[PDB]
């Protein structure tokens, strides 16, 4: 295998766009939602934990997520990237670029959790939790889905991380919760998240090809359909649209199309978008509401991927010998496994912090 | 024709940059200019109409703008992108990428109009207007200039949309008008518009070649020359420069070089920049002032393209058998047609809304 | 030599990212630090001087920096880019793209100086200074390091501008000084600087290859290590971390890895990051503090490059026949020359302005 320079270029720029989603996208999103007296401390926590994830990833994270091992974890052969030649190729790009791209996914996943709970948790406690949950939840689930583990081996479909990123993070946020002063700032964060999400979704193709093109167009369409679905529902129930409603609808569509984007047709993208925007509004009606959107819209997206990948409905098609019924059962099992795995690990992380330093802010 | 992956990569990233111009560039620009009590509602209108344009484009917009038809419109053969194979090539890129790029141009054009008039117009009325004006003005003019229609057939020169985007939108804004509390926010929006404009101007080449390179350098030079021309004029007339003056000068140069950027030399870019910055200041002296800059600077740019494309002046050269006099007459005719076409359609759109829901805010 | 379109694409996008560092990155960074009554005037000065640098670069700047001449300056053969054919290739890209990329480096260097001193200096005086210092300091030092001049001829290692950008600007700021109201704004500027810095560091490879990949990964790692080093030091000395501390640590790592990024291993990047973050904190303890970070962290970075380029330590290796001792001596000499050259020229610029218009604000 030799590296293609067009693919090297595309994938480095997509990596920069995903890093932009955390620094400053998710920080500004939460910054406009929470109480003003809490903004400075939350911004500090997001920045410090981002740095921590970047370091853990290179020391051992990449090796245990993407090295060859078993169904649940990889190996320790790639510690500090040892034994990876600079000219080594993964797919059609230099392996060093694959390291950076996958690291940026771990960063945004952790940013989602830390932003929402920074108000309520002690600084030393959040650091302990991130170390436990990244090592024992993010890494294994990434291995299972994208690193040749249990879920991949059974043919699960998840293009850009409905399970790995969204459901994984949403469950961890909810467990923590159990244990808007500046709307122009919220809008600015939403917009930066949207633009960076093209790197997130299209970059998951690993090459500047027709599947990257499909994922790009589907991202535009599903986001737009979800803005419109949320806003219509808000007009019907509340009498009029709102700015926070429009931004929430955008996020709902982006989350919903995440697992599906490289597998479905544009018609499918429009239908997934509308359903996701409405499911999101239902979800928040029943800033920890962000875990309601990422969780509900993630499950909806993962199920609907097992429908709209069908050739009959404009998709790329299921694998050889796989019926729609079979794919649907596999999607359901992958969602169930992600929920229980993340839920158990988070509980352990929060409890270990509480025994060592105490959880609640002094 | 086979797709080139370097061109696929370049054009997907340029599309993301043009979407960044609307979400959040133009929204933050207007957000700092208008009254504070009106900011939230304007941001909501920009976001909802952006979603509407994205959907209309994929349902029928692309087909009637870029399909083969007559001098004024295309066809309905590409509804919801039916009959476009995923591997179909347009120029040197996948056709799906061309769909996304051209859609992003329709979005920024509509954002220019909606941002300025959101204070004054009822929500349901703006939705009606966008549907009428996009369908009957944006689409036909795009077909005429870039889709093999009337103006292209007569050899009109317009690299990135002096007519299609700027004059088209400026006239529609002026008809509506007939019928700064946060300057750091205005500066931030201006800066995001500038950075995204490299995707807008260089991406109009359709490939990562020497014409894309020329357009890039000309964008840097004309923007800088227009900042300096506006600021000098402000010092002469008002006694000193201002922040709003500097931002306005930047926009003036960007608008002026839009039709010319892929056809002229760097010397030509510097001259066009200076004249545009001064014409812009004259224009505002005689946030609906934004329609004064986009309109005056658009006309100036379109005329000056018919001069500075000449080989003698450092340009790429006129087509075979075309004198400078002939090109100039064709530029003038293209400007006249755009003004009357947009003016008539806008009047019809505003009037239909007024008869159905009433125009003015309740 | 023929141009590679993948490299053309990569280098145009990296240029847009470096322009983003000045407009609006450095402007927002300083905007949150200085007194509120001074913000508008500083933003105006940054914008006008940016335009001035763009014009001077194309008129004569590129020619005297990158044309063939002597050890200290180039020539006047490329005035207004005359005699450069549109299809001319430099390395593996069109020469017009090289012009734009190198111009963006001159812009950020000047932005660093103007942002910090805008409060204190008269407008007409800053314009005079920029003209003198760009022409007689930035241009010659760029020629010496990257244009085949004195320092390159002796084998100096400086991948992305520890001398040319950071030490050069830091000394000029300090000479001027001799002669935080909005922390969310400071965080936003820091984040935009970080994202743009991938274009700055990876783009310095000139191609989308394995050296660009190495520079990208090293940027992620050194920034993260420096955030952690600064924050630890702040906890030890001050009792707790702060938002301004975290942002300062990020900048320290970015500056430190600038000269080293394309030459060192990931282990080396982590060590350079930690040392830079701690040296930065020491430096500020002993907004002109920004010249303390860029100066101290620049020197540290330039020295440590002469160590960690060694094959033994995971680097790409020294040139044929060059020991670690020899490279270290050459690094020290390059730092000494940059300090004295910039220091002398700045003194002359500030003095000429003071004799013509007066330096201090009226």
Three-state DSSP string of chain A: CCCCHHHHHHHHHHHHHHHHHHHHHHHHHHHHHCCHHHHHHHHHHHHHHHHHHHHHHHHHHHHHHHCCCCCCCCCCCCHHHCCCCCCCEECCEEHHHHHHHHHHHHHHHHHHHHHHHCCCECHHHHHHHHHHHHHHHHHHHHHHHHCCCHHHHCCCCCCCCHHHHHHHHHHHHHHHHHCCCCHHHHHHHHHHHHHHHHHHHHHHHCCCCHHHHHHHHHHHHHHHHHHHHHHHHHHHHHCCCCHHHHHHHHHHHHHHHCCCCCCCCHHHHHHHHHHHHHHHHHHHHCCCCHHHHHHHHHHHHHHHHHHHCCHHHCCCCCCCCCCHHHHHHHHHHHHHHHHHHHHHHHHHHHHHHHHHCCCECC
Q: What is the rounded (10 degree) CA torsion for A28, A30, A35, A36?
A: -10
Nearest CA to B258 among B154, B108, B74, B359? B108
CA B6 to chain centre: 26
Residue with tokens 């500083």: C42
Q: Are B65 and B142 in contact (CB under 8 A)?
A: yes
Q: Which residues contact C149 (CB under 8 A, 6 or more apart)?
A: C70, C71, C72, C73, C140, C143
Q: CA-based Rg of chain C, rounded to a whole angstrom?
A: 19
- The answer to whether the Cβ–Cβ distance between B195 and C27 falls below 8 Å is no
Residue with tokens 């030092």: C141
Residue with tokens 């839920």: A343
Pick from A8, A48, A99: which is nearest to C231 by CB?
Answer: A48
Query: Cα separations (Å) of B187 from B192, B193, B240, C107, C299?
Result: 9, 10, 18, 18, 34
The CA distance from B149 to B326, in Å, is: 19
- A209 touching chain B per CB within 8 A: yes
The CA distance from B26 to B186, in Å, is: 9
The CA distance from B27 to A184, in Å, is: 10
Q: Give the pair of three-digit tokens for residue B46.
A: 């920009």
Q: Which residues contact B327 (CB under 8 A, 6 or more apart)?
A: B155, B157, B306, B309, B318
Nearest CA to B57 among B123, B109, B124, B102? B102
Nearest CA to B193 among B155, B219, B225, B170? B219
Q: Which residues contact A94 (CB under 8 A, 6 or more apart)?
A: A3, A8, A86, A87, A88, C209, C210, C213
Pick from B213, B225, B250: which is nearest to C55 by CB?
Answer: B225
- C232 touching chain A per CB within 8 A: no
Q: Give the pair of three-digit tokens for residue A161.
A: 């991380």
Residue with tokens 């229609």: B149
The CA distance from B277 to B293, in Å, is: 9
Which residues of chain C make contact with B209, given a CB cutoff of 8 A?
3, 5, 8, 94
Q: Evaluate whether the domain defined by B1-362 bears CATH number 1.10.3430.10.
A: yes
Strand partners, C90: C93
Nearest CA to C102 among C70, C141, C72? C141
Its sign, for the CA torsion C115, C119, C122, C123, is positive
Query: Cα separations (Å) of C311 from A77, B272, C37, C262, C323?
Result: 21, 53, 53, 13, 11
Residue B204, annotated ligand binder? yes
Q: At what angle do helices C139-146 and C95-117 cross, to 10 degrees?
A: 130
Strand partners, A360: A121
Q: What number of residues does chain B have? A: 362
DSSP C259: T
Q: Are A32 and A97 in contact (CB under 8 A)?
A: no
Which residues of chain C from 60 to 99 reach within 8 Å of chain B, CB to CB? 80-81, 86-87, 94, 96-97, 99
Backbone angles phi, psi at B121, to 5 degrees: -105, 140
Longest dimension (CA), chain C: 61
The CA distance from C64 to C37, in Å, is: 40
Q: Are A303 and A336 in contact (CB under 8 A)?
A: no
Q: Are A129 and A41 in contact (CB under 8 A)?
A: no
| Closest CA of chain A from C240, distance in Å | 10
The CA distance from A14 to B313, in Å, is: 40
Closest chain C residue to the Cα of A17, Cα to Cα: C195
**DSSP for B305-360, written as a single string:** HHHHTSGGGTSS-PPTT--HHHHHHHHHHHHHHHHHHHHHHHHHHHHHHHHHT-SB
- A191 touching chain C per CB within 8 A: no
| Closest CA of chain C from A179, distance in Å | 26
SS (H, E, C) B133-170: HHHHHHHHHHHHHHCCCHHHHCCCCCCCCHHHHHHHHH
The CA distance from A252 to A234, in Å, is: 14
Residue of A29, A184, A231 best to disrupt the B interface, most CBs of B under 10 A:
A184
Q: Which residues of A210-247 are buried (b: 16+ CB within 10 A; e: fewer)?
A: bbbbbbbbbbbbbbbbbbbbbbbbbeeeeeebbbbbbb
Q: Are C312 and C283 in contact (CB under 8 A)?
A: no
The CA distance from A139 to A64, in Å, is: 7
Nearest CA to B131 among B357, B361, B338, B288? B357
The CA distance from A152 to C225, in Å, is: 34
**Helix residue spans in C57-85 (DSSP H):** 62-66
Quick check: helix, strand or coil at residue C94?
Answer: strand
CA angle C316, C319, C320 (to 5 degrees): 125
- C216 touching chain A per CB within 8 A: yes
Q: What number of residues does chain C have? A: 362
Q: Are B260 and B304 in contact (CB under 8 A)?
A: yes
The CA distance from A121 to A152, in Å, is: 35
Longest dimension (CA), chain B: 61
Backbone angles phi, psi at C91, to 5 degrees: 70, -110
- The answer to whether the Cβ–Cβ distance between C241 and A44 falls below 8 Å is yes
Strand partners, A89: A94
Q: At what angle do helices B183-202 and C5-20 cross, to 10 degrees?
A: 170
Residue B273: CB atoms within 10 A of its CB come to 30
Q: Which residues contact A340 (CB under 8 A, 6 or more apart)?
A: none
Nearest CA to A40 among B100, C244, C252? C244
Pick from B207, B223, B241: which is nearest to C48 by CB?
Answer: B241
Which residues of chain A make contact with C209, given a CB cutoff of 8 A?
3, 5, 8, 94
CA C290 to chain centre: 13
Whether the upstream peptide bond of residue C24 has omega within 30° of 0, thus cis, is yes
The CA distance from A215 to A220, in Å, is: 9
Whether the upstream peptide bond of residue A24 has omega within 30° of 0, thus cis, is yes
Residue C156: CB atoms within 10 A of its CB come to 23
Half-sphere exposure of B132 (CA within 13 A, CB side): 21
Q: Are B212 and B10 in contact (CB under 8 A)?
A: yes
Q: How many CB pairs under 8 A join A and B?
A: 128
The CA distance from C184 to A29, in Å, is: 12
Q: What is the rounded (10 degree) CA torsion for C299, C253, C138, B271?
A: 180
Longest dimension (CA), chain A: 61
Backbone angles phi, psi at B68, to 5 degrees: -80, 130
Nearest CA to B267 among C80, C99, C78, C85? C80
The CA distance from C266 to C226, in Å, is: 14
The CA distance from C255 to C129, in Å, is: 24
Q: Are C20 and C65 in contact (CB under 8 A)?
A: no
DSSP B38: G
- B358 touching chain C per CB within 8 A: no
Nearest CA to B216 among B269, B163, B180? B269
Backbone angles phi, psi at B317, to 5 degrees: 105, 145
Which residues of chain A make contact with B28, given a CB cutoff of 8 A?
184, 188
- A217 touching chain B per CB within 8 A: yes
Structure resolution, Å: 1.8
Q: Give the pair of three-digit tokens for residue A9.
A: 């270029």
Q: At what angle do helices A95-117 and A123-133 cross, to 10 degrees?
A: 140
Expressed in angstroms, the distance from the first to the final Cα of chain C is 55
Quick check: helix, strand or coil at residue B90?
Answer: strand
Its sign, for the CA torsion A276, A280, A286, A288, is positive
Quick check: helix, strand or coil at residue B210?
Answer: helix
Its sign, for the CA torsion B51, B53, B55, B58, is negative
The CA distance from C45 to C65, in Å, is: 25
The CA distance from A131 to A335, in Å, is: 24
Whether the upstream peptide bond of residue C317 has omega within 30° of 0, thus cis, is no
**Helix residue spans in chain C (DSSP H):** 5-20, 27-33, 39-56, 62-66, 95-117, 123-133, 139-146, 150-153, 168-178, 183-202, 210-238, 243-257, 266-285, 290-308, 324-356
- A208 touching chain B per CB within 8 A: yes
Expressed in angstroms, the distance from the first to the final Cα of chain A is 55
The CA distance from C212 to C93, in Å, is: 15
Strand partners, A93: A90
| Closest CA of chain C from A23, distance in Å | 6
Q: CA-based Rg of chain B, rounded to a whole angstrom?
A: 19
Residue of C44, C82, C85 best to disrupt the B interface, most CBs of B under 10 A:
C44
Q: Give the pair of three-digit tokens for residue B38.
A: 């009106």
Whether the upstream peptide bond of residue C347 has omega within 30° of 0, thus cis, is no
Backbone angles phi, psi at C94, to 5 degrees: -65, 135
> How many DSSP H helices and E strands does chain B contain?
15, 2
The CA distance from C320 to A128, in Å, is: 47
| Helix (H) or strand (E) segment spanning residue C89 | strand C89-90
Q: Are B183 and B244 in contact (CB under 8 A)?
A: yes
| Helix (H) or strand (E) segment spanning residue B176 | helix B168-178
Q: Are C251 and C26 in contact (CB under 8 A)?
A: no
The CA distance from A80 to C90, in Å, is: 36
Which residues of chain A make contact with B31, given a CB cutoff of 8 A?
184
Q: Give the pair of three-digit tokens for residue B95.
A: 């056709």
Quick check: helix, strand or coil at residue B118?
Answer: coil
The CA distance from A335 to A254, in Å, is: 18
Q: At what angle do helices C5-20 and B5-20 cross, to 10 degrees?
A: 20
Q: Give the pair of three-digit tokens for residue C152.
A: 């390159």
Half-sphere exposure of C118 (CA within 13 A, CB side): 28
- The answer to whether the Cβ–Cβ distance between B13 and C9 falls below 8 Å is yes
What percent of the residues of chain B are helix, what percent strand, and what percent coil, each to the nearest 5?
75, 0, 25
Pick from A4, A17, A224: which is nearest to B55 by CB?
Answer: A224
């Amino acid at each position: 295998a030799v590296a293609d320079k067009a693919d090297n270029a595309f994938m480095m720029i997509c990596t920069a766009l995903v890093l932009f989603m955390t620094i400053p996208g998710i920080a500004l999103f939460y910054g406009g939602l929470i109480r003003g007296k809490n903004v400075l401390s939350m911004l500090t926590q997001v920045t410090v934990t981002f740095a921590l994830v970047c370091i853990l990833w290179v020391v051992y994270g990449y090796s245990l997520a993407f090295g060859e091992g078993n169904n649940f974890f990889g190996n320790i052969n790639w510690l500090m990237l040892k034994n990876i030649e600079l000219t080594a190729v993964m797919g059609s790009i230099y392996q060093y670029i694959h390291v950076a791209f996958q690291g940026s996914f771990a960063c945004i996943t952790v940013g989602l959790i830390v932003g929402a709970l920074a108000e309520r948790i002690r600084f030393s406690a959040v650091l302990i939790f991130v170390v436990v949950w990244l090592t024992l939840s993010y890494i294994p689930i990434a291995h299972m889905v994208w690193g040749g583990g249990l879920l991949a081996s059974h043919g699960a479909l998840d293009f850009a991380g409905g399970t790995v990123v969204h459901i994984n993070a949403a469950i961890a946020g909810l467990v923590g919760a159990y244990l808007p002063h500046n709307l122009p700032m919220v809008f600015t964060g939403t917009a930066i998240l949207y633009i960076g999400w093209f790197g997130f979704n299209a970059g998951s193709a690993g090459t500047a090809n027709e599947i990257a093109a499909l994922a790009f167009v589907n991202t535009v369409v599903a986001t737009a359909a979800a803005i419109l679905g949320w806003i219509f529902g808000e007009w019907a129930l509340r009498g009029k649209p709102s700015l926070l409603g429009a931004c929430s609808g955008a996020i709902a569509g982006l989350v919903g199309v995440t697992p599906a984007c490289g597998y479905i047709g544009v018609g499918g993208a429009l239908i997934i978008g509308v359903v996701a925007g409405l499911a999101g509004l239902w979800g928040v009606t029943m800033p920890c509401d962000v875990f309601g959107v990422h969780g509900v819209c993630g499950i909806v997206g993962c199920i609907m991927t097992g429908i709209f990948a069908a050739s009959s409905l404009g998709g790329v098609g299921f694998a050889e010998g796989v019926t729609m019924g079979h794919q649907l059962l596999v999607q359901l099992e992958s969602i169930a496994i992600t929920i229980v795995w993340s839920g158990v690990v988070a509980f352990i992380g929060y409890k270990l912090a509480d025994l060592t330093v105490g959880l609640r802010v002094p």
